[PDB]
Each structure stands twice: as C-alpha cells, then as structure tokens.
Design a protein around this ligand. Structure first.
Ligand code: ZN
Ligand code: ZN
Ligand code: ZN
Length: 84
DNA sequence: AGATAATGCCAACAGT
DNA sequence: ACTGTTGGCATTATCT
C-alpha cells in the first residue's frame, strides 16, 4: 500500500525515502521569482529555464524528425536515434 | 581567481 | 507502458 503521507498536503507514498523526497518540496528555500508567473525557484538558472517555457512554441527542434523539444539536451538525446 | 549564468542528470509527474 | 514535461541540484561554462 502507501501508508506514508505528506504532513503538509494530502499525498501518499510507498516508502519513507520517496516520502521525504516529496515532502522536502513544501519547505525548500526558493528566493527566485519568475516575473511572468509568481512561481518561485531555488536557482536563477532554473527560473530562466522556466521563463523559456512561457513562450508558446517550444524552441528546440529536430532537423530531420521535425519534432519539438523544450531543452537542448533532450534534442541531443533524440539525435541518437539517427545512428544509421 | 572569484562570482554568476546555463546546462546536464535525475527523480517525480502527467498526457496519451 | 511509453515518453514527454517539470523543478531541484551538482557541475560546467561564461562573465567580472
Ligand atoms: Zn506534500
Ligand atoms: Zn513563470
Ligand atoms: Zn530526429
């Protein structure tokens, strides 16, 4: 089952390790706000990356597959499918 | 060299 | 089940 539950919100998890991994979220120190939406972040790079997502179209794309990716390394990993 | 910005990895999560 | 997303976070790249 999932006996372990978050104290802050109504969530449940199988084991204490994943429980703590979730429960830390409610208490992290986030000093970096996004000027678009009031969402907070721990590192400024994370905040700027989030700001990227507020743009409608997803920036990165595949030259051959014609897909759309939010982040550079995801496009790089997708490029591995064309090993020939 | 020291401070700050970007990026890659990872786990949690969610659309299909 | 598959595979995209997200934010956190350590590490790397760029700026001063
Ligand atoms: Zn919670
Ligand atoms: Zn925002
Ligand atoms: Zn492709």
């Amino acid at each position: 089952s999932r006996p372990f539950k978050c104290s802050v919100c109504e969530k449940t998890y199988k084991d204490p390790a994943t429980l703590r991994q979730h429960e830390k979220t409610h208490w992290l120190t986030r000093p970096f706000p996004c000027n678009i939406c009031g969402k907070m972040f721990t590192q400024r790079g994370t905040m700027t990356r989030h700001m990227r997502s507020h743009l409608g179209l997803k920036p990165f794309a595949c030259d051959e597959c014609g897909m759309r990716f939010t982040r550079q390394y995801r496009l790089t990993e997708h490029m591995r499918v064309h090993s020939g």
